[PDB]
Design a protein around this ligand. Structure first.
Ligand SMILES: *[C@@H]1O[C@H](CO)[C@@H](O)[C@H](O)[C@H]1NC(C)=O
Ligand SMILES: *[C@@H]1O[C@H](CO)[C@@H](O)[C@H](O)[C@H]1NC(C)=O
Lengths: 535, 650
């Protein structure tokens, strides 16, 4: 019995237990190391203790780890004698089947060992067994001091010949999915032997400064039209910080201050509600559809946080539907007092632009609709947006529209799930209009166009979105960027959407299955590679 | 101008209670505050991301330590795993008294933190250090929490391969906190290093690894080791010491061996290329398992000139010695190596890590250093001299010199007095007689115009044992007598373990009782207010290794030199009911060729136990914010706040 490590057990301790162990039959200095884990105290490791086992007179063997069959072996049992008297003993290997002894049997060899010395005896035994044969040698002692020893180490012989390794490197892709590995066909295959096969698969896996946008967080104030110029930038900044998770860089209390300000603004604009919820510039002054749509989109965006009433906005959406004409278009019953917050709307055409903005507004209002109830309202708003999309698609097919108009129509059709042909023609026109990270100090209109185009291309990123997003980022990095109001909100939404599109991770799984029809049956295997390498 | 103080370690750990400190100051003493603290994530609409807990303390008791728990169920409900750039979470303190009374902008104040899923302690162990292909590998695990107690969570055991590959994984929950497993190595794998890694199933980066290497081998019968006469060789011009080395060959059971030893020499460069000599090969006969080999200076010079390298080009070259002893009449042989033998121009090494940077004016600056010979134990009785050079902007740089002799543990404590209004301090530390080692550093004075600083001095200047009572003294510097009390905290393993207040006197001695909690290293941060500006200083204090608290004793029936086939009644002692995982290992495996990776001992337990420390550096800083951050603590007073740590490690 010649182990390397045997005392491998776990027991409980009651301050005292006397376990009696049996020493393994070897001549070394065994070291015992223990670890105690206590529920109350904790973990301690014992100081190492050396339990030196020694026999005064012994024989030592070292069988080579590999011995080729049919080949000559040299066996060297060496005698160790630490006694005080010269010993004359005999050495003989017991006759064992499967081995040819040099003497071919139990034939003894005489040798005298002087005290404190060693004397080896050569042996030449060529193996003839198949896999492993046991061998024991006897060193029998004389009458003067009858001391003896016997060691029995199992001798293992390897198989015939040398070993061979075959490597089949391959690459895998989601075409050329299925591939077949040819079976073993090397003619040097030995009919008997081992056949171990292993599979080795390798995964081979491959912004704006928050400080500037923080200044846009402002308290609502002013009359019915000065209030939006402070809620829209505030809501945009809140959404940008929330969705880009830059609140950590800002002081911690800013977010709570932001939600307090947005609640105050929500209350401030809510008090100007008419009977139909159109939210005019003034209570006495006539309503404007552009203002109502702006309110619809901003309140729908903010509704995820403020505890508003969903039904009080459904009637606003219904009133907005009442302003649609026969072709699906929209016109303002009353223009805004100030055209500054219209920005890209003013130009050669407004009705196309106004309709695109309204279509964007309504689709943001579908989410706030309750899933239960208001089914006729949902169906009628879907019909309205279908008619509006038809009209905008006809206008886009007409072409000859402005860059702002083209971009906003493209975004409107993209977000409304327009028919594929109209989406294709609008996208083609927008790409034709694209001007060369140079694209489109820039005025408000140009950043309007770039933001809307970025939204469309995101809703349509392949070498294109990043290159124009860099331009938008460099333009916004200018001090006091986004001078107007709506450009601020859409550009912040654009950076948020672009940034989430840039930073997103998938499972990256490369599961494969291996199957074959062996003579012993059919087998299959599966190797997950979601997250390393497996064999 | 009252303020609220929020104190918390800069990094929180999921699944473990979090220590948070809240403080009151400049209170009219006639009012009581109440409020709650919790964790919330801004990106998910500030959902309460941890259970609520409140302090509701008064001015008479202005200090309160809160144990806030962070269950992982809220965390996965919290969408913390859904963040996109870094695990960044927000800690806040809500109380209506902050808004109505102080007229702040909101009734809340918080801090920015980084969370990590790493938690607990996981210890791995292997059946034997060296393997050869074709055997069965045994191993076991230990599940332990932050408080060093057995845990019953769920872990996943993973077995890595030689090529950084996975072969075998398992999942198991341990009711007994100890788990055993078997594993059979393939009989075809090439000789190389493997690895076993285990981590908690709920966690992600809480993995712990152990390395066992497999190599074709047969266990030897005796080991040979080469012990040089001196671990270092002086290569200073003019004088060269003699090189001598002793060859010791012993049987694995302690008896001496006889035979002939053969040695060859060479040179080792930085990367590891070998360049041997010719004609230097010495063959000698062993006597009582001992043999002494020396080379004269003349023959060494002849070898260098024959190789044409030059004596002056031994700046970092390593002398190479190989042993080829053959035991007769056995006939077998084995090798040994002496790679760790450099050519150095100085016999001593200088450590300058413990001494603090960021000097404080008006207080006695302290210099700490550790003298130790190369590749050896710390040495004692070595004089060390310093040349302090104060850089006074308004006068000539004064040079102050002072020496002191090694205490015995290798450490030096030489206080030096520094005057006011200095620009910087430059000093040179020289230790050795003769051939001293030179190590020079400079430190800049803190910017002027700020409030008075704080000074911490340690009288005994020795690392106390566990159970003692270390003492510290505090004194203010500059015209800052406005305050009336001192605030001090004790940090250990990134946890606020003790908090207390002390009044002002001429001498302010503060006593701390070191216990098993404060091990192996505890920080100590204290601060006071110069009206509104916080000012603080910190001092890292090391703790001696001590001993265990479970008191495991293992012993045998004395040294009777037992024979094979006999029986030994083992004796073992424990202080409490516990489970002991005994392991018997042959020493000859250590003799087998390997890097001789040390088995598990108290050192690694302490190192992993302290691996959760956040702060880095000896301590001390220019501004209160900088020193507070460098001590691994998050600070927020309502006007000044700590920036988030840029990464998990310093
Ligand atoms: C062993 O042999 C040597 C041969 O010189 C002899 O001197 C010695 O006395 C012998 N010892 C014993 C114990 O017979
Ligand atoms: C966990 O394993 C990774 C593998 O890359 C390693 O880098 C890291 O150090 C391990 N963590 C530990 C040991 O705490």
């Amino acid at each position: 019995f010649f182990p390397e490590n045997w005392l491998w057990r776990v027991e409980t301790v009651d301050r005292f237990q006397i376990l009696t162990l049996w020493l393994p039959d070897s001549l070394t200095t065994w070291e015992i190391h223990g670890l105690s884990l206590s529920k109350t105290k904790g973990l301690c490791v014992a100081t190492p203790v050396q339990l030196r086992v020694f026999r005064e007179f012994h024989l030592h063997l070292r069988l080579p780890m590999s011995v080729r069959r049919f080949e000559q072996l040299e066996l060297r049992p060496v005698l160790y004698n630490y006694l005080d008297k010269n010993l004359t003993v005999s050495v003989h290997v017991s006759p064992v089947e499967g081995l040819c002894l040099a003497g071919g049997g139990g034939l003894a060899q005489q040798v005298l060992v002087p005290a404190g010395s060693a004397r080896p005896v050569a042996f030449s035994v060529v193996p003839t067994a198949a896999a492993a044969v046991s061998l024991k040698v006897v060193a029998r002692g004389s009458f003067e001091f009858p001391v003896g020893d016997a060691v029995s180490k199992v001798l293992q012989i390897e198989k015939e010949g040398a070993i061979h390794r075959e490597e089949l490197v391959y690459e895998l892709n989601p075409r050329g999915r299925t591939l077949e590995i040819p079976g073993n066909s090397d003619p040097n295959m030995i009919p008997d032997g081992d056949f171990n096969s292993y599979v080795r698969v390798t995964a081979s896996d491959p912004a704006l400064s928050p400080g500037g946008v923080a200044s846009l967080l402002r308290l609502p104030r002013g009359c019915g039209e000065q209030t939006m110029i402070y809620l829209a930038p505030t809501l945009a900044a809140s959404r940008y910080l929330d969705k880009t998770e830059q609140w950590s860089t800002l002081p911690p209390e800013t977010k709570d201050h932001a939600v307090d300000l947005i609640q105050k603004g929500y209350m401030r604009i809510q008090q100007f509600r008419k009977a139909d919820g159109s939210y005019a510039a003034w209570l006495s002054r006539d309503s404007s559809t552009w203002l109502t749509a702006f309110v619809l989109k901003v309140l729908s965006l903010a509704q995820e946080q403020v505890g508003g009433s969903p039904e009080k906005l459904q009637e606003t959406s219904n009133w907005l539907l009442s302003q649609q004409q026969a072709d699906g278009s929209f016109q303002d019953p009353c223009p805004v007092l100030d055209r500054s917050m219209q920005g890209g709307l003013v130009g050669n055409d407004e009705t196309v632009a106004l309709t695109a903005f309204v279509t964007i507004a309504l689709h943001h209002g579908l989410a706030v609709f309750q899933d239960e109830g208001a089914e006729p309202l949902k169906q009628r708003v879907e019909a309205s947006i279908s008619k509006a999309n038809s009209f905008l698609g006809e206008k886009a097919s007409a072409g000859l529209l402005g860059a702002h108009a083209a971009a906003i129509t493209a975004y409107a059709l993209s977000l409304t799930k327009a028919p594929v042909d109209l989406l294709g023609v609008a996208h083609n026109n927008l790409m034709a209009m694209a001007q060369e990270n140079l694209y489109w100090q820039a005025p408000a209109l140009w950043i309007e166009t770039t933001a809307y185009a970025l939204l469309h291309l995101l809703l349509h990123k392949a070498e294109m979105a990043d290159q124009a997003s860099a331009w938008l980022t460099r333009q916004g990095s200018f001090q006091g960027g986004f001078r107007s109001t709506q450009d601020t909100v859409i550009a912040l939404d654009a950076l948020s959407a672009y940034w989430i599109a840039s930073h997103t991770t998938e499972e990256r799984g490369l599961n494969v299955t291996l199957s074959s029809t062996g003579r012993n049956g059919f087998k299959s295997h599966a190797l997950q590679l979601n997250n390393l390498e497996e064999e | 101008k009252p303020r609220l103080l929020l104190f918390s370690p800069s990094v929180v750990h999921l699944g473990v209670p979090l220590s948070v400190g809240v403080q009151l100051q400049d209170v009219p003493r006639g009012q009581v505050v109440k409020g709650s603290v919790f964790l919330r994530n801004p990106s998910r609409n500030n959902v309460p991301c941890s259970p609520k807990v409140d302090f509701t303390l008064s001015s008479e008791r202005d200090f309160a330590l809160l144990s806030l728990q962070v269950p992982l169920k809220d965390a996965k409900s919290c969408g913390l795993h859904q963040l996109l750039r870094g695990p960044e979470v927000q800690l806040v303190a809500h109380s209506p008294w902050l808004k109505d009374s102080l007229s702040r902008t909101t009734n809340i104040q918080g801090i920015n933190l980084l969370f990590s899923s790493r938690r607990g302690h996981l210890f791995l162990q292997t059946d034997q250090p060296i393997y050869n292909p074709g055997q069965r590998v045994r191993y076991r695990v230990f599940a332990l929490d932050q408080k060093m107690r057995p845990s019953t969570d769920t872990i996943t055991v993973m077995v890595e391969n030689s090529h950084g590959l996975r072969v075998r994984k398992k999942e198991v929950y341990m009711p007994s906190s100890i788990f055993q497993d078997d594993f059979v190595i393939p009989d075809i794998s090439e000789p190389g290093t493997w690895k076993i890694s285990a981590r908690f199933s709920d966690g992600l980066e809480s993995n712990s690894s152990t390395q066992f290497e497999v190599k074709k081998y047969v266990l030897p019968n005796f080991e040979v080791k080469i012990t040089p006469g001196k671990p270092y060789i002086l290569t200073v011009p003019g004088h060269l010491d003699e090189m001598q080395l002793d060859i010791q060959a012993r049987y694995i059971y302690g008896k001496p061996v006889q035979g002939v030893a053969y040695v060859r020499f060479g040179l080792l460069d930085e990367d590891g290329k070998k360049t041997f000599f010719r004609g230097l090969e010495s063959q000698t006969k062993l006597v009582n398992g001992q043999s002494h080999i020396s080379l004269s200076k003349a023959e060494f010079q002849d070898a260098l000139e024959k190789l044409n390298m030059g004596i002056t080009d031994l700046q970092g070259l390593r002398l190479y010695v190989a042993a080829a002893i053959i035991e007769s009449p056995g006939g077998e042989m084995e090798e040994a190596e002496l790679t760790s033998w450099y050519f150095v121009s100085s016999p001593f090494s200088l450590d300058l890590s413990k001494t603090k940077r960021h000097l404080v004016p008006g207080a006695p600056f302290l210099l700490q250093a550790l003298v130790r010979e190369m590749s050896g134990s710390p040495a004692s009785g070595i004089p060390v001299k310093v040349s302090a050079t104060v850089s006074s902007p308004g006068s000539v740089p004064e040079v102050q010199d002072i020496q002191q002799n090694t205490d015995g543990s290798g450490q030096v404590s030489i206080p030096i007095i520094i005057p006011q209004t200095i620009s910087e301090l430059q000093l040179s530390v020289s230790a050795g007689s003769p051939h001293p080692a030179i190590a020079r550093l400079t430190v800049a004075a803190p910017p002027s115009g700020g409030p008075g600083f704080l000074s911490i001095e340690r009288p005994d200047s020795r690392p106390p044992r566990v159970g003692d009572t270390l003492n510290l003294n505090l004194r203010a510097v500059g015209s800052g007598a406005t305050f009336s009390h001192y605030y001090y905290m004790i940090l250990s393993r990134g946890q606020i373990v003790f908090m207390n207040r002390e009044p002002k006197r001429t001498l302010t001695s503060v006593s701390v009782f070191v216990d098993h909690h404060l091990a192996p290293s505890f920080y100590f941060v204290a601060f006071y207010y110069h009206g509104d500006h916080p000012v603080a200083n910190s001092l890292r204090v090391d703790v001696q290794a001590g001993a265990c608290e479970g008191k495991l004793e293992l012993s045998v029936d004395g040294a009777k030199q037992y024979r094979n086939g006999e029986s030994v009644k083992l004796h073992l002692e424990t202080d409490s009911l516990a489970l002991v995982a005994l392991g018997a290992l042959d020493t000859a495996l250590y003799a087998a060729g390997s890097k001789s990776h040390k088995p598990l001992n108290m050192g690694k337990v302490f190192e992993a136990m302290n691996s959760y420390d956040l702060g880095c550096g000896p301590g001390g800083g220019d501004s209160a914010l900088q020193v507070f951050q460098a001590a691994g603590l998050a600070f927020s007073d309502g006007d000044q706040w700590t920036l988030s740590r840029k990464r998990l490690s310093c």
